[model samples]
Target: SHPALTQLRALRYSKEIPALDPQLLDWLLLEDSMTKRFEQQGKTVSVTMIREGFVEQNEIPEELPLLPKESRYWLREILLCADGEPWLAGRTVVPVSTLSGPELALQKLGKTPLGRYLFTSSTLTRDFIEIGRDAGLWGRRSRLRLSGKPLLLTELFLPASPLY
Candidate 1:
């Protein structure tokens, strides 16, 4: 029940806009000799630490659950390629409020089975959330400007599609 041209359009859209400057782009790309082979690219990317107050175990509500003792939480953001590969971008660490009882269990589960399952089942959802959040916040908190170009596209189209 799909059009043949959809695939072509999908591929065309999936291609990256080769960094505005190939030379600069090349420099922007980074490779990790230990793990990843391909160079990751992007610009003006940064990761900033955020300050958060420590919550005492007794301070947590008895009605709720709590995370492990001395567990720290952070909020981070970064730009990434269409394939969810890291590109130049920025990240921020945020504070986490403590939860006790069932809430604590649920939050803990997010770091384990529940979280892993969701991530495996819908990796794109997580990618979009991070990318979208970074795009909005970075635009406001920093001086960087978005190129206003398509960064990523879904690859669920047919071949030779005229309508994109």
Candidate 2:
């Protein structure tokens, strides 16, 4: 495991982390598009595509539920910014098998907020979110399906984020 990930505490339900501020928890538990939420708050939201490609299995988080048997999968990492300041760090893992059909659009999402595509899709559904914190950073991750194909989406709220 990578050093940064190794230091991360196990992800758990938001209810288990009572130390979190209620306001912050609201965002972590939000079921709507984060992009929309930010816009509603009068903050301009933009995405900065960091990198994306097939990654080795070690790159996947051990806490990710329902691990697939595939050895290679598409991984995307990005920063979702508000008013030009990075407020969120986003990571997504899509198994090679789940990248087909309408889900293939996930690969071409450069500089576009994932929520824009996810929330608009009628076929999108997800499991409950799991929250985690490390070095004062609060994060949430969930398993979601587009057209019944699964992918794991994780978002970490950075220090510059107002959610803190």
Candidate 3:
């Protein structure tokens, strides 16, 4: 099942420009979702539906030299990727994570307002907790929740874009 789904090859690129060829990106996203579902239980899971959504552009810092003008508007999509039958159906886990590592790299490079915000905000730190809550993946009597931002993937030096 995994092999059938992963027939399309995903592009390998640096984190700075990890955007796959659009078609490949779409295929891989679908394939990954299917794989996740199929592996959950011993049964073969089939994807029923998929959905995508984009977030509105918010005020970003201007002083950030590494920030891309085109990346101001980021997309936040929720892939339904449902499974099961018509009578008793439910959605599989949807992998919700950002793909704009370059934008994040830029933020790290400038260390400006947006960079500061990204660094200090509890959003990224609490991502696992939020996802666990949403997916009901926590064990009973578990009180541990991830808190505060930690610089796990922060790059000390910005790599030059190939476009330049």
Candidate 4:
């Protein structure tokens, strides 16, 4: 139930998806921290925060499966640039329930990449990975649980991404 957040097609499990360019699949199925991967490319990686705020109820229908109708969520959108090239666009939906103790750090993230904190969390568990593609673009989303609470993370590889 991924919403029409962008032009990306609906996401499905990788097994159900048709074969993708091996290069793109390598990035799409990446289970580690993408921030690390970008850094390893030997290019200066930086995060450009595009937007972050609490979304209005009924604004995101896709979230209903994990959150109650009245539950609120923090939405973050950012671009991961490599040597100043927009390589990836990431969007995350963090439910209010997931905010607690040190978890409050999620709200204070400015230019910091979310992956920096996500991958460092010992309680993190990924439930599934799904791929979405259209035209020449590729994207993936995963349902991640932290301390038993859920957050949805989606990453779209832009044309400038080395995965192409």
Candidate 5:
């Protein structure tokens, strides 16, 4: 199990995720969308599917329980690769209720970045951000609601991943 996931705590974009390498922190905290960042830096961003199905709310961040639950939600995990190098392990949980809305595009997101729909929307809003840190892993998660439906996106960076 990823024990580092337990360290997730609410923080501001300007706040720090402790013990993170300065080099890693540079990309970890970037407010820009990761896919866009990778492309801008001449790296190709691609997605590698892991698993996508419902897991208990507890399996995710605790803040999720604070909101209302759906009959079931879609839990997805994948790798965001940069030019064939796995740079990020991304996980997203979206409610079943919103699946018919803009989320339909997300369910079909193969190599596409989830941020593309999010950052471009006028209704997209963020709740809070949390950080997870460990010797070999660093992750950040945040709650976002699009079209008034809540979802969570967590991105974890591996120790071997390139930061430059």
Candidate 6:
């Protein structure tokens, strides 16, 4: 493992980016929902709930610059599957400060994709993408704001995920 991976900060992809796999770039750089795309092949996308609960902000990586110190947030980790094959792992965090009736909707999700609501929600915007490069793909983080309150969602593509 590269020593710098643990200290990696999420950033927008660019040609100058280093240490990323050439073949995985397409999937990594997609601006749309990976879950949405997987279901497009006349298939179904399902969420395999891994863990969901409250945790400290320090528990999440790339936090020095992304989130405040000593904060707590709701953390959601899930495996997205297309036709029963796990394709991606997604983890999301919502600060306790931002918890609202609308944001609380995320908690009701079970076997549901976050993109289903985020893509159509009138109250949110996903503006920045943060990438962490590694063979197991340390991370891919996306920042979305709900009425200016920030939420972070990170997704990691599995190695066997379709490349083309």
- Model 2 worst lDDT window (10 residues): 1-10
Best by TM-score: 4
What's the CA error at residue 1 for candidate 2, in Å? 14
Let me know the TM-score candidate 4 reaches against the reference structure: 0.82
Candidate 6 structure quality by residue, lDDT tens digits, 1-164: 12222223333333243455876666666766687778766678888877788888567755435654547888777778888887777777777776765666666666678764463554666677756655444457777777777778777666546753
lDDT of 1 by residue, 62-123 (tens): 20131233344332222322233332232222223323322233233321211122223222
> 146 in model 5: Cα distance from truth in Å?
1.4
The TM-score of predicted model 2 comes to 0.80
Query: Candidate 2: misplaced stretches above 4 Å?
Result: 1-21, 63-65, 116-121
> What TM-score does model 6 achieve against the real structure?
0.74
Model 4 pairs whose backbones collide: none
Candidate 4 lDDT over residue span 111-131, tens digit each: 787664554654877876778
Q: Per-residue error at 139 for model 3, in Å?
A: 12
TM-score for each of the candidates: 0.18, 0.80, 0.22, 0.82, 0.72, 0.74
lDDT of 6 at 3: 26
Instruction: Give each model's whole-structure lDDT.
Output: 0.23, 0.71, 0.22, 0.71, 0.64, 0.65
* RMSD of every prediction: 18.4, 3.4, 19.8, 3.6, 4.6, 5.1
Query: Could you tell me the lDDT of residue 71 within candidate 5?
Result: 62
Each prediction's number of clashing residue pairs: 20, 0, 0, 0, 0, 0
lDDT, residue 149, model 2: 77
Q: What are the per-residue Cα lDDT tens digits for candidate 2 across 11-129? A: 34453546667887788878744777877778989987776888877767552445476877888877778898877777788888887876777787778787744635547778656
Assess the local accuracy of residue 145 in candidate 3 as a C-alpha lDDT between 0 and 100.
14
lDDT of 3: 0.22
Off by over 4 Å in 5: 1-26, 54-63, 117-122, 160-164
